[PDB]
Design an enzyme around this catalytic site. Structure first.
Site, PDB file in Angstrom:
ATOM      1  N   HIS A   1       0.853  -1.167   0.000  1.00  0.00           N
ATOM      2  CA  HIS A   1       0.000   0.000   0.000  1.00  0.00           C
ATOM      3  C   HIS A   1       0.907   1.242   0.000  1.00  0.00           C
ATOM      4  CE1 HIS A   1      -3.278   2.706   1.243  1.00  0.00           C
ATOM      5  NE2 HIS A   1      -2.286   3.322   1.857  1.00  0.00           N
TER       6      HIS A   1
ATOM      7  N   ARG B   1      -9.464  -4.108   5.156  1.00  0.00           N
ATOM      8  CA  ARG B   1     -10.674  -3.377   5.518  1.00  0.00           C
ATOM      9  C   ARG B   1     -11.530  -3.041   4.303  1.00  0.00           C
ATOM     10  NH1 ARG B   1      -6.494  -0.148   5.169  1.00  0.00           N
ATOM     11  NH2 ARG B   1      -6.674   2.094   4.637  1.00  0.00           N
TER      12      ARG B   1
HETATM   13 ZN   LIG Z   1      -2.289   5.708   2.211  1.00  0.00          ZN
END
Ligand SMILES: [Zn+2]
Ligand SMILES: [Ca+2]
Ligand SMILES: [Ca+2]
Length: 1276
Positions: A229, A369
């Protein structure tokens, strides 16, 4: 491919792959850091990120750096060489996990080869300047303890250990003189603070973390994904496409609003999934153009670059070709570098929509999530990432050999506990809002529990700008998605040019902007006396010491008293819970209160069909008191009236601009270049529709659906608090007992908790379906319609913009000008249907939408109902309802239209509801009661049709009319042609079931058929294929209209319109729902009443009635008299004949299973109807005597309803007493014997009993009775 190097922290410096680097933010002043080259251009520095922080900041204090994060502090992490080596080895394992898959390997590749342009905005187009802090970083070659020699090197990424907050990973770009090369097409050195062991925790309110209120919930993150990420952020910054634009800013005006930082679209793009949808299409393009513009500047720089002063060694041509490869520029047979639009879109979409946390998580089978906008739980610590028993380069925690693959079980906190340890709260810091009453009494609330509502300023007003249309003007759309399958098989995306020497001249210009951080207060105290959701959830908790508690339905009492816990469940449930018993009955009570909890909880599946609401959780208002004080009054009722809107804590102010005007261009003499400007204005028009919808969708997600998310969570916390409190009470009572008593108590706390948990999970599923439905409800009726209004206004202003234009081109458009004229009128003739999957591809969002649209009740665009002596539209579209004085209304939802001019209802429909989607598709339903003809007026009854409901627009529309015993539906196309279908009941029957009797009517219309249903059964069908357009959203006028006799009237009830054809099955169910009642009905269909005069009727013996025999105490069965007069067009059996009965109560309205006394008038006296008692015969006459306790006969009667289908019939049964299931018989009629024609009487009979149980129920039975009161609708 991609090689991951291996080293040991203690390995010696070699100034090549292991160096003493001088990080960009050290400004080249002081100590260096040992760094390790994990791959080409990527470095690892296993030490705490301290740039911009103070040593003390590393300790846990009463401050926080980020408001929406549960921060963990540990100044000891990485404080020894062995800790540093572990960090190093872990980073090596994570990178290996990333490249273990094609997708991740590509991410690493683009990043390695995405070298920063040599220079930034300040650098002349003709030069390469490597002497800038965002391009070159130094390494100390000099011997130990001296900086005699510094050599420069190029780098792409530098990863450090965490900063003060271990779980706050972040990717940082370099800003010089207020600008950022990584945001202006150049790219620059990227930095990252990262911690691999302390990963975040998340869970889905919709899902179920192994479902267990008592067991740990949520899932822990795979650090490899967390790293990827951050690498996506790194990728964006290397390609210099990390542009800033219009951010999503939280509204912070109300105390209940979540305070947080501004969110850039690059942040939501990076996460992917549904998050890109919060960024309007308008802004998606704004960012697109900016990046394209930055690239334009770069390609121009390549066409002009000539030298490099900073490094004589730089080979211009070598670099020109590397950047050309990096940005995918095209080179002509001249050396000219150009931007190929197609290849640009591909690269852009790949970087912004291909590489996203969501897409990677999916490919790697890692759970993450649901959204950037989802509650952030406390982090955990992975015991040992280097232990292959726990974490593998190939599967992470979801190791299949350990049967940890199926359902991400390996990331499940309740399942894989051997993988992590919880964290010491004493070391956690969290932004709290303290809400104080001004009495006072404060409640600490986590800023995470607040409502996140995007401010209006977050959205792009760009739709209001004008558009210049040319024969060239074209359609602009950006797909916020990118097939991951082809990105993985995409050949010519990969670097096709070798990576140049990383060695360069030393950096001497250390000019750079170093971010300075400081902690901010961890708690903000605010004043409010509001008792909303926070206060409510609070009233449901209790101190860790208080052990003797009791439930209470008083919110206030619970706030004040510490041993008092508020409960939103029933008074009954609450009293039973505070009940104290003997040990010998403790087990029975525990079993009772638990099963009761489940029952209460499961009322979350309540249906409200009569009110056109399939699902309602009636206790949500009591549980949270969110929105317009939903804890007061009756929630169901309030919802039926206002709908979803009442649940919103705040009603957002939407941005829905007047779509700017189109300025067409003239292309005189050039027919085509003029036609294109029309065809193009049309297509650009479609663009404005779609872009407006996206603007709505983005707003729905960040201002409304966020609130409903908060409500779903609130309700999960509420059910838990109730279960927790119960268990607390149960445990407390048990421990009051002696150990000897406890021993003989049958208790299984694992059964209790299981059942309590099972009850909650079921409730949560209902609550979730309900809340999602409300959310989608608000979108479709409270947000979309308003956009439609503006879009039609525009569509219109544009219609008379194109027509004019075509006009002024009569000469140039010649023999077709008239052709386009239509083209324009017809193209703009249909409004674009809204489809959510056009703006998002998220599975949950799509399903919420498809489900909402699958519920027929959501096609109701008109639903007239009674409310405080007046009719109003409860469809949710706000139709305007004007009821005039002539109309009579009652709370049974019936309204009467008389012959009076003022007896009318005016309905102005919502103009923004999609209706005429072209092909005609809709239905209308209602209940009607049409009076019997006047015996002395049958001539005007039969002939003479009067309209009752009229709906026309410009001479076209629909109409319901009546010609005596016939109801009629009529359609009128936009021309004037007319087709009609109708139902007609007979007026020569002995007993009619339509005349003056309430009956259900439904009229449906699809492409080629108009049908009429009566009580759910099809009666007639009319082929309406001819008919052209049919305007139907004009005003609806309810008024008797035509040559009507002054005494003419009509009763109507439950009027509804659907924007779709109802199936026979839908109709029949609507019939049943609207027929149901707890009370019985009379012959006419009205509610049956006590103390009301009634003549009796028998469904079995239509023409038979009851007369009290001149002699004895029994009821004869004479024959109904009949139409004595002389009209051959009418006939019937008098109904107001026979005895005048009156129903009496035993222990107002007559309900089922009620016990009564069937009396009847005889001159002045009121007699009763008894039975014998011991008639050992199957049936026998009843006894009609005065009001005496003839203990020889039975009196009491229990009126029942055996027919499961709609009916106005009811049964009368006797019982030994209001208790003994022991029956006696049902009232009816049976013929006996008498010869000088036998004689049928008021026979009671047990023979019925067996019969009633028969299915399908027997309608023609002799025990089926009906009551008939004098009614103005029937005169004989
Ligand atoms: Zn971020
Ligand atoms: Ca978007
Ligand atoms: Ca309390």
């Amino acid at each position: 491919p991609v090689t991951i190097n291996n080293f040991n922290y203690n390995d010696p410096i070699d100034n090549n792959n292991i160096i003493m680097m001088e990080p960009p933010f050290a400004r080249g002043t002081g100590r260096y850091y040992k760094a390790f080259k994990i791959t080409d251009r990527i470095w690892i520095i296993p030490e705490r990120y301290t740039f911009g922080y103070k040593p003390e900041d590393f300790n846990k204090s009463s401050g926080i750096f980020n408001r929406d994060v549960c921060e963990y502090y540990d100044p000891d992490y990485l404080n020894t060489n062995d800790k540093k080596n572990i960090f190093l080895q872990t980073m090596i394992k994570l990178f290996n996990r990333i490249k273990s898959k094609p997708l991740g390997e590509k991410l690493l590749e683009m990043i390695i080869n995405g070298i920063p342009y040599l220079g930034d905005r300040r650098v002349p187009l003709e030069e390469f300047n490597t002497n800038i802090a965002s391009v070159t970083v130094n390494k100390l070659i000099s011997n130990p303890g001296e900086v005699e020699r510094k050599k420069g090197i190029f780098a792409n990424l530098i990863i450090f250990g965490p900063g003060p907050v271990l779980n706050e990973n972040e990717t940082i770009d370099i800003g010089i003189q207020n600008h950022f090369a990584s945001r202006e097409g150049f790219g620059g050195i990227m930095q990252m603070k990262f911690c691999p062991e302390y990963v975040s925790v998340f869970n889905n309110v919709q899902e179920n973390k192994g479902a267990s209120i008592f067991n740990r919930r949520g899932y822990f993150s795979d650090p490899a994904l967390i790293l990827m990420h951050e690498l996506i952020h790194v990728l964006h910054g290397l390609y210099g496409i990390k542009v800033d634009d219009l951010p999503i800013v939280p509204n912070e005006k109300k105390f209940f609003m979540q305070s947080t930082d501004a969110i850039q679209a690059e942040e939501l793009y990076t996460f992917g999934g549904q998050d890109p949808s919060i960024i309007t299409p308008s802004t998606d393009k704004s960012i697109y153009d900016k990046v394209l513009q930055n690239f334009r500047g770069i390609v121009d720089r390549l066409n002009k670059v000539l030298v490099c002063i900073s490094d004589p060694n730089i080979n211009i041509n070598i670099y020109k070709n590397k950047f050309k490869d990096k940005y995918k520029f095209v080179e002509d047979s001249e050396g000219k570098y150009s931007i190929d639009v197609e290849s640009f879109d591909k690269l852009y979409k790949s970087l912004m929509f291909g590489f996203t946390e969501t897409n990677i998580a999916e490919n790697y089978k890692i759970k993450t999530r649901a959204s950037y906008f989802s509650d952030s739980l406390p982090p955990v610590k992975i015991k040992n990432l280097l232990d292959n028993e726990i974490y593998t380069i190939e599967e992470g925690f979801n190791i299949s050999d350990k049967d940890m693959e199926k359902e991400y079980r390996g990331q499940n906190k309740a399942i894989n506990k051997q993988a992590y340890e919880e964290i010491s709260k004493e070391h956690l810091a969290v932004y709290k809002i303290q809400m104080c009453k001004s009495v006072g009494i404060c409640i600490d609330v986590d800023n995470e529990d607040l409502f996140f509502i995007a401010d209006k300023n977050s959205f792009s007003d760009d739709l209001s700008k004008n558009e210049r249309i040319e024969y060239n003007t074209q359609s602009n759309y950006i797909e916020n998605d990118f097939p991951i399958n082809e990105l993985i098989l995409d050949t010519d995306l990969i670097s096709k040019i070798e990576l140049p020497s990383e060695n360069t001249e030393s950096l001497t210009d250390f000019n750079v902007d170093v971010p300075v951080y400081e902690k901010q207060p961890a708690i903000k105290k605010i004043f409010t006396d509001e008792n909303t959701i926070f206060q409510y959830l609070y009233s449901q908790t209790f101190p860790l010491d208080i052990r003797d508690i009791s439930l209470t339905s008083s919110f206030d009492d619970a706030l004040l008293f510490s041993n008092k816990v508020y409960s939103f469940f029933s008074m009954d449930y609450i009293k039973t819970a505070n009940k104290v018993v003997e040990a010998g009955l403790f087990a029975g009570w525990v079993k009772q209160i638990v099963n009761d909890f489940v029952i209460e909880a499961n009322k979350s599946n309540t249906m409200d069909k009569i009110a056109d609401i399939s699902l309602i959780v009636p206790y949500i208002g009591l549980a949270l008191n969110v929105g317009n004080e939903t804890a007061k009054g009756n929630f169901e009722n309030a919802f039926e009236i206002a709908g979803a809107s009442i649940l919103l804590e705040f009603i957002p102010e939407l941005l829905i601009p007047v779509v700017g005007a189109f300025l067409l261009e003239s292309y005189i003499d050039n027919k085509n270049k003029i036609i294109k400007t029309i065809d193009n204005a049309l297509t650009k028009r479609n663009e404005k529709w779609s872009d407006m919808y996206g603007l709505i969708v983005a707003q729905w997600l960040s201002t409304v659906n966020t609130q409903f998310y908060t409500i779903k969570e609130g309700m999960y916390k509420a059910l838990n608090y109730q279960a927790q409190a119960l268990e607390e009470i149960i445990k407390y009572r048990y421990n009051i007992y002696s150990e000897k008593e406890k021993s003989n108590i049958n208790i299984d706390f694992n059964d209790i908790n299981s059942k309590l948990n099972e009850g909650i999970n079921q409730a949560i599923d209902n609550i979730n379906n309900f809340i999602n439905g409300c959310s989608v409800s608000y979108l479709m009726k409270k947000m979309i319609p308003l956009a439609v209004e503006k879009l039609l206004d525009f569509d219109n202003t544009l219609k008379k913009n194109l027509l004019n234009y075509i006009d002024e081109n009569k000469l140039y458009l010649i023999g077709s000008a008239e052709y386009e004229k239509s083209k324009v009128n017809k193209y703009l003739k249909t409004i674009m249907p809204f489809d959510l999957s056009i703006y998002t591809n998220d599975t949950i969002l799509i399903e919420m939408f498809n489900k909402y649209n699958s519920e027929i009740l959501n096609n109701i665009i008109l639903n007239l109902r009674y409310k405080d002596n007046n009719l109003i539209d409860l469809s949710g579209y706000g139709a305007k309802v004007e009821v005039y004085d002539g109309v009579e209304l009652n709370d049974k939802n019936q309204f009467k239209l008389t012959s009076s001019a003022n007896s009318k209802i005016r309905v102005t429909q919502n103009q923004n509801i999609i209706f005429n989607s072209v092909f005609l598709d809709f239905s209308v339903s209602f209940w009607i009661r049409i009076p019997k003809y006047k015996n002395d007026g049958i001539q005007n009854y039969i002939h003479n049709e009067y309209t009752i409901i009229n709906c026309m627009k410009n001479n076209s529309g629909w109409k319901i009319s009546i010609r005596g015993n016939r109801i009629i539906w009529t359609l009128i196309d936009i021309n004037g042609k007319t087709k009609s279908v109708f139902f007609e009941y007979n007026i020569r029957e002995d007993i009619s079931e339509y005349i003056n009797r309430w009956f259900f009517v439904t009229i449906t219309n699809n492409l080629n058929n108009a049908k009429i249903y009566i009580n759910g059964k099809l009666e007639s069908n009319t082929d309406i294929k001819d008919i052209r357009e049919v305007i139907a959203n004009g005003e609806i006028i309810f008024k008797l209209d035509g040559d009507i006799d002054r005494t003419q009237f009509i009763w109507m009830k439950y009027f509804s319109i659907f924007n779709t054809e109802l199936s026979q099955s839908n109709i029949e169910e609507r019939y049943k729902i609207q027929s149901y009642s707890e009370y019985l009905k009379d012959f006419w269909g009205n509610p049956l009443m006590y103390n009301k005069e009634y003549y009796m009727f028998n469904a079995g013996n239509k023409n038979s009635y009851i007369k009290l025999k001149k002699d004895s105490p029994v009821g004869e069965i004479l024959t109904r008299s009949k139409y004595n007069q002389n009209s051959k067009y009418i006939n019937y059996r008098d109904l107001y004949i026979g005895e005048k009965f009156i129903i009496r109560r035993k222990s107002d309205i007559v309900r089922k299973e009620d016990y009564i006394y069937l009396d009847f008038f005889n001159l002045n006296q009121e007699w009763r109807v008894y039975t014998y008692k011991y008639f050992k015969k199957e049936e026998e006459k009843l006894f009609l005597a005065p009001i005496s306790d003839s203990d020889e006969f039975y009196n009491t009667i229990q009126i029942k309803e055996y027919d499961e289908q709609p009916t106005y019939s009811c049964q009368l049964l006797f019982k030994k007493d209001e208790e003994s299931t022991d029956e006696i018989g049902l009232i009816g009629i049976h013929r006996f014997y008498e010869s000088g024609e036998y004689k049928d009487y008021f026979c009671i009979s047990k023979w019925y009993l067996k019969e009633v149980k028969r299915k399908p129920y027997n309608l023609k039975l002799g025990c089926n009775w009906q009551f008939i009161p004098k009614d103005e609708g029937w005169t004989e």
